[PDB]
Design a protein around this ligand. Sequence first.
Ligand code: MQX
Length: 557
Amino acid sequence: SQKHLQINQTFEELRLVTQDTENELKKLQQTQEYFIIQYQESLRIQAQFAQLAQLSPQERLSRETALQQKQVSLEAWLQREAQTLQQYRVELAEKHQKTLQLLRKQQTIILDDELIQWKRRQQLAGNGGPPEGSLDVLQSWCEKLAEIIWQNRQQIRRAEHLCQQLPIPGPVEEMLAEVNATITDIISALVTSTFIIEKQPPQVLKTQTKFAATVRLLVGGKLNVHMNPPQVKATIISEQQAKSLLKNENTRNECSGEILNNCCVMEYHQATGTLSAHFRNMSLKRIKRASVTEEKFTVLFESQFSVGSNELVFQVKTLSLPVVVIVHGSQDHNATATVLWDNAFAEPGRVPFAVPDKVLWPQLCEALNMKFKAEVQSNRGLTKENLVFLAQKLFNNSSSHLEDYSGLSVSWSQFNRENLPGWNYTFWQWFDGVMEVLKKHHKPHWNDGAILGFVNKQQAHDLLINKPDGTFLLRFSDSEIGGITIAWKFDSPERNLWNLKPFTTRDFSIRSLADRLGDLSYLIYVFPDRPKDEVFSKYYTPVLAKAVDGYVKPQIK
Ligand SMILES: CN(C)C(=O)CCN(C(=O)[C@@H]1CCCN1C(=O)[C@@H](NC(=O)c1cc2cc(C(F)(F)P(=O)(O)O)ccc2s1)C(C)(C)C)c1ccc2occc2c1
């Protein structure tokens, strides 16, 4: 891939230049060590002058002049090697600065781009979007970042220890403080950012229901963390409690309810190299709520762990995607609309649960189509024609051209607060009502094309006129939520086009949609041409004999 293999180039380049500094560090370590032994030779030259100063000037003539020559040269060498030791120290800090600034570039790419892309993909998958996929790619990149930063951290620890053993003043001290300032800044960011929720908890959480979540740390294996697997504490929080948590204005263990099994320990898995806490049996015990259906909450996962050193401790916190809490499950219907809006229209880097008031119509379309396909479980989504029908209903306009609605904004109030033109419901109620009846028992029929649905009473009439005396279509009724009305043709005294009473799921519980179509004589050709028993053959109930009626084997009528 494009910037996928570009990452690997600037990753390998980091490992190469980090090895060059490793070579220069072991080299300087030797240069210094020799210099220390040579300095003791300079000290030992003087003590030699004392034992030399005993005998006659017959021996002292040669001894004192040779010892002077050896002391001058060694003293000039020690003085030049002393500058060399300092110059080399600087060149190592310059190199360490260079590989760290380059490491920051690669860090930001992994964390602020590829990670955010994964998290956005995850966000939209809540609304039915495409799956975000495995973290494998980002774990490998995070491990590299963790490894390279750790290597550079221990290198500058060793570089520092040499300086304390042999101090040389100047720029070195300040440049070393700067590399350390950067080194901690990089690890802190790397640590906090890779404590992520792999499998988010249910966004429409029903009280007293077993739910699950999975919080992975991407730098578990490649750092001194899996050795002591840390305890992770799940905690339900409010939208205000989250805005405070992020601005650092929290007050102790502030929260909004109890969670059974809200504590779990991370597990290290060899081969996968993954450190992950799978909260398999969580459950909501109670809630706080100072609309109920428009109330955002979040599962706050926290943990504390050390990274090798006893001093090096980090406190990690990650927030779940906003969840709406329900108790009776009856209001799942409206909860879904708030979650839908949030998952679709959340702005990157927003303050906790900041969604826009209005959005342009085709933005909302994208979302409705996304969720629609996902719910009815079919590849047949909302066509440009169906999109016009919903634009007509929502905006209360007459136009049949989709491009007309392009600049129009749907507010949250227009979507699921104020009711439609002359109805006892909102657009989301009508739309979700339709997905619900389809999903509940019409998934095959929708997929098979047998339910045109998104056509108005007029649209249906200006279609079945030019059709034989039994042609009919299936339509979504505007008056009865989740209702499917039949539009058919049959020439009689006054009327020749007819709209039968809409069927609600109640009616479908008694007799099937297919059992009801086959039950009616007049209905004989499904629109446009297709015969009735051709489209609904499959779904016809083969009346099976009862046991009470005395049948030893399964029989049909
Ligand atoms: C074996 N079998 C299944 C039967 O018994 C079949 C017999 N049947 C009928 O013919 C019933 C009996 C009463 C009148 N009737 C009708 O069919 C009449 N139709 C209506 O009364 C209405 C049509 C619409 C359409 C909309 C709408 F288009 F969707 P909108 O866009 O405004 O929402 C809304 C309200 C209404 S009221 C008639 C066709 C005009 C004669 C009938 C019985 C119990 C039913 O329960 C559900 C459907 C249904 C069907």
